[PDB]
Design a protein around this ligand. Sequence first.
Ligand SMILES: *Cc1c(COP(=O)(O)O)cnc(C)c1O
Ligand SMILES: *Cc1c(COP(=O)(O)O)cnc(C)c1O
Lengths: 384, 384
Amino acid sequence: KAPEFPAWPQYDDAERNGLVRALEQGQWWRMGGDEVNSFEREFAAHHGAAHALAVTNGTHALELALQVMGVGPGTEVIVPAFTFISSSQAAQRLGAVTVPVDVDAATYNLDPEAVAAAVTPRTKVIMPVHMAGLMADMDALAKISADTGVPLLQDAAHAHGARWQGKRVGELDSIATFSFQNGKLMTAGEGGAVVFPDGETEKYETAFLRHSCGRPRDDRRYFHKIAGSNMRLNEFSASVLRAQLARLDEQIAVRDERWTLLSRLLGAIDGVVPQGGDVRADRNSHYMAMFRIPGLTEERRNALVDRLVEAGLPAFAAFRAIYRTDAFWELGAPDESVDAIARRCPNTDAISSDCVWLHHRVLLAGEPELHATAEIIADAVARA
Amino acid sequence: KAPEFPAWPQYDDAERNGLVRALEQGQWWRMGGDEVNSFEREFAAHHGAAHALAVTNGTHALELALQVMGVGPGTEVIVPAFTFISSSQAAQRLGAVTVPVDVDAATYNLDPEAVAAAVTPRTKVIMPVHMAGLMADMDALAKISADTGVPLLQDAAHAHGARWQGKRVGELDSIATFSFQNGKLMTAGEGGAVVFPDGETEKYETAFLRHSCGRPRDDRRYFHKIAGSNMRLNEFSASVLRAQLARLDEQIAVRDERWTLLSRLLGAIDGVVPQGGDVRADRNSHYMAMFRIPGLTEERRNALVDRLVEAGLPAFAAFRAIYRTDAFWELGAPDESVDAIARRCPNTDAISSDCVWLHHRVLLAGEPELHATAEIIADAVARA
Ligand SMILES: *Cc1c(COP(=O)(O)O)cnc(C)c1O
Ligand SMILES: *Cc1c(COP(=O)(O)O)cnc(C)c1O
C-alpha cells in the first residue's frame, strides 16, 4: 500500500564510464588527471561563476571560504540559527565567534532585519543559507552588506542549480559553497565546492593555495607560501559529479512540478504549514520537502516523524536550533546565554521543534504517490 | 637509452570491479555502504592495530590525531625539522606551537637526543616521521615518552606495511597516521587513515565523532555532541584502497631487494651517501630512494636534480627545512628566530640542501635499470 519513491542517489552508464575514465588516466589526484579540472569548469559555468574550487566536502568548502574572507580569531560570523551545524562549526573551527540570528517564519531563511541588529563592529561575514533550495533574500541581504561593508557568503549546500531574480548562485556578487554529500541534489557520496563570482579571482587563488598545503601547483622544491590544509578532491569523485551535474536541471524541474502539487495537499491539512515560497526566487532547487505543524513539542514532532517512517515515508525531524546543540557551546560561542539567544530567535526556537521534512526523492515520484503521501500525513497529523 | 620504470599508481581488474561494486551499492558515503567499513578493518588488521579510521587525507589524519591527543592553544608539538609541511601544519592549524627538532645525519629520522632537550612543560606530542619507510627509533623515543609522559604520534605516511623490531605500525603503543595521496605506497589519488593501537578505543571513538561533524552515527535529531569537521572518506576511494592494500607487501618485498642493490651502487659513487639503514627496522617500506651529496648548496643540488630528470629519472629535491618555509612562520611559530632554530638543527640544515630522492617506482624496476640509473647518477654527480 505504501507509496514507493525513486532511489537516491541515482546513476547509470555515465557514472560507470566516468569511473573507468578516471581510473584509466593512471593518475588519481587533480595534479595528474583532468576530471577535477573539468568538473570545476562545468560546475562554475553551470552556476554562472567566474571560478569553481572543488574540495573534499561542503564543511571544508565553508571553512576555506570563511578563511579567505578573513574569518579568524577576533571575528564574528552571523549565521541562521536554523541550519546544519557545519554552518557555525566552520566559523568556530577558525577561532571566530558564531552569532546565531533568527530566520523567517515562513521560508526558514535568515531574517534580514534580525541580521541588521546582530551586525557589530566585529562582524566579518554574514552567511545566508538557502533553506531547502529556496534562496534567502539576497536583495535585502545585499543592501545590509553594502551599508555595513560586511561581505555575504552563501551556504548553497541545498541550492544546486537555484536562481534569484533570474540570476544564478554564482551571479550574485558573493562567494558561495556547496556540498555533494550522499543525500544532496548531486553527489559522489562526499564532496564540496567553493564558487567565486566575477571580481573575486584573488580570493580564488588564495583558496587554491590554502586547500593544497599552501603549495603552488608546480612548486618542485617544497616552497610552502602560506598555511592551511589539504582539501583536494580526487579524480574518481569528480568524474561521478560530472555525470550528476548533467541531470541536475531536469531533476529540479520534475521536483518543482511535484512540490506545487504536494505543497497544496499539505496546506489543505489542518495544522500543517508547508514551507512558504518567494516569487523572487524564480528557481527553487527543492533539496527538502519541508512543513511545520505549529504548536507541536519536539517529542510530538519526533513521534509524528517516527509514525511517518512506519508508513513508508522518508521523513525526518528538521534541524535543531544550533544554540541547542552541545557542539555549539564547546568553542567560540557568544557571551550571551542559551535563553538570551532563544529570546531573540523565536522563529528558530519553534521551527527547531515544529518542522518535518521529506527526502527530495519523494519530489521525483509521480502525483499519485504524492496523493498517497499526503493522506498518510493527514492521518498521522490528526493523531499527533 | 633512458631506463624505463614501472608506472605509478598501478591498478588492474581489482580496481575496476571495486569501483563498480562501490557504485552498485547505490549509497556512496560510509553510512550507507560497506567499503569504508571493510577497508578500515582490513587496513587495521594489516597493521596489527585495534582500530583504523579512514579519512579524507593524511593531513587531516594528523589534524584529527593531534586533536584527540589534546593538541591545541597553549601546547607544543615536537616534529622533525626535515619532513613534509603537513607534519607541522597540522599542529599549527590547531593553535599549537610547532617545535622543530633535528634528525639523524644518516637515516634523516627524528633525533632522540634532540627531542629530549626540546621537551618542555608545554609539550603535548612528540611526532616521529618514518623517513622514506625507515622507522624512527621507537625504542629510544618510547623511553623519552615514558620519562616525560609526553605521548608519541607516528607520522607513518611513508611507512605503509613497515616494521620495527618485528612489530607493525599499529603494534607499538602509539596512534599513527597514514596518507594515501597519489604518489604514496598505496593510493586512491587522495586519502588518509588514523590507526589506533590496543588500549586506545576512547580516542578512537572521539576521533570518529570529531571527523563526522560531531554527530553520533545513528543520531536522527541533529544532536551534535562535540565540535570538529567532516573528514569522512567516500566509498569509491575506499574500494580502490582495498585493491591497493592487497599488493602492498609484495611491492615492499620487490623494493627491498632493489634498494639493497641501488644503495650499494650509490655508496660506490664518490660524494654520494644513500640513506643509512637500521637493523632494528626489520621492514623498510621504501617510499623513497634517498641520497645525500654532502657539501652541495641547494642550487647545485637542484641543478643535479634537473639534470637527472633530463636523463629520464624521476628525481626530486628532498624536503626543505620546515623553518625555511614562509608557511611555517605564518602561525603558531616558536619564539626562537630562523638562525636560532637552524643552529640546533644542523643535520636538517644540510639535508635540506643536500638530499636527492627518486620515486619509489624506480625500486620496482629490474636490476639492469638500477645499473643504468646509477651510471646516469655517477656521471651527473661528477659534474655537479
Ligand atoms: C550538508 C550541509 C553542509 C556541509 O556539507 P558536507 O558535505 O556534509 O560536509 C553545509 N551546510 C548545509 C546547510 C548543509 O546542509
Ligand atoms: C604526504 C605526507 C603527509 C600528508 O598527506 P596528504 O595525504 O598528502 O595530505 C603527511 N606527512 C608526510 C611525512 C607526508 O609525506
